[PDB]
């Protein structure tokens, strides 16, 4: 029971880290496409 | 189940998407599934009465 509880907590912890990193890649590629197709301000 | 539910254990039920593991674990005891919805206090009183 205690092992299952701790495993649940740590796995749910890593899920949001994966989400944050994939969204960072999302933003980086979006900025790349923006700077390629049409240059923006700054 | 044996202990009061922490907020993390209450998972959200969203329809449309397959959401197959919930359908697999319907017989389970610990996880409690809710709509992304809550009853207002007046409707709470009406349902209670």
């Amino acid at each position: 029971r205690v092992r299952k509880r701790y495993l649940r907590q740590e796995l749910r912890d890593l899920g949001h880290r994966v989400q944050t990193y994939c969204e960072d890649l999302e933003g980086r590629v979006s900025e790349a496409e923006a700077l390629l197709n049409q240059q923006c301000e700054l | 189940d044996r202990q009061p539910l922490n907020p993390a254990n209450i998972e959200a039920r969203h329809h449309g998407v397959s959401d197959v593991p919930r359908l697999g674990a319907m017989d389970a005891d610990e996880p409690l599934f809710v709509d992304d919805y809550r009853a207002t206090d007046d409707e709470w009183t009406l349902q209670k009465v």
Binding site: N37, Q38, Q39, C40, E41 | -
Partner: protein, 218 residues
């Protein structure tokens, strides 16, 4: 740059800018593509207005656009500084079609009869023009090769290439040579300073190539 990146620029839309009368807020960085598209649009409307009046040559929009840009560099600055309403008569009057025909058909003649002032570009037919080996007069000739053959090893290539460099550096004034080194420096010499220090470095590496070892005799 326009020739390479033409497909991206060609899709730019200018209708809201031209059709709308009052000035609309526009991004500061978006000037480049908009200005280039406006210039090439004015080029296209310049060509199409004077076709009212042997081989027939078909030119696409980008090719003729970059050609006419090269011929007169004043197009870009005149278009940006002056409005389209006053730009149209200027481009109509200055579009000397006979000069365009002469430039696009210029061959067998070098330098061209026309002065550098009025036109900036021309064209050459590769088939009609043969290719010489001008090295045979500059550095591949026999006498300079014999003069520069002296070297530490047979693996060294002929040094007439460096010999002409040394003569030019030592004889000609430094002002001319520094003017070229700022003008027509090679890619490998971009980090380098001038001709004299180039000679310095080449002599230093030549001295570095040959080393000395002393041995005793019984």
């Amino acid at each position: 740059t326009l020739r390479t990146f033409w497909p991206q620029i060609s899709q730019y839309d200018l209708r809201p800018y031209l059709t709308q009368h009052q000035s609309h807020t526009h991004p500061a960085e978006t000037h480049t593509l908009h200005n280039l598209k406006l210039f090439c649009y004015l080029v296209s409307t310049a060509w199409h207005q004077r076709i009212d009046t042997g081989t027939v040559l078909r030119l696409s929009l980008q090719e003729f656009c970059v050609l006419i840009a090269a011929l007169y560099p004043e197009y870009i600055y005149t278009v940006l500084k002056y409005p389209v309403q006053m730009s149209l008569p200027s481009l109509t009057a200055h579009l000397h079609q006979d000069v365009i025909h002469a430039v696009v058909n210029n061959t067998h003649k070098m330098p061209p009869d026309h002065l550098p002032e009025q036109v900036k570009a021309f064209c050459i037919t590769p088939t009609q023009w043969p290719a010489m080996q001008l090295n045979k007069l500059f550095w591949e000739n026999k006498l300079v090769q014999q003069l520069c053959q002296v070297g530490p090893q047979k693996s060294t290539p002929p040094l007439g290439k460096l010999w002409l460099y040394a003569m030019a550096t030592l004889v000609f004034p430094q002002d001319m040579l520094q003017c070229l080194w700022l003008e027509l420096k090679p890619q490998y010499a971009e980090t380098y300073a001038s001709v004299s220090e180039l000679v310095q470095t080449l002599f230093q590496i030549f001295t570095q190539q040959c080393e000395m070892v002393t041995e005793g005799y019984t």
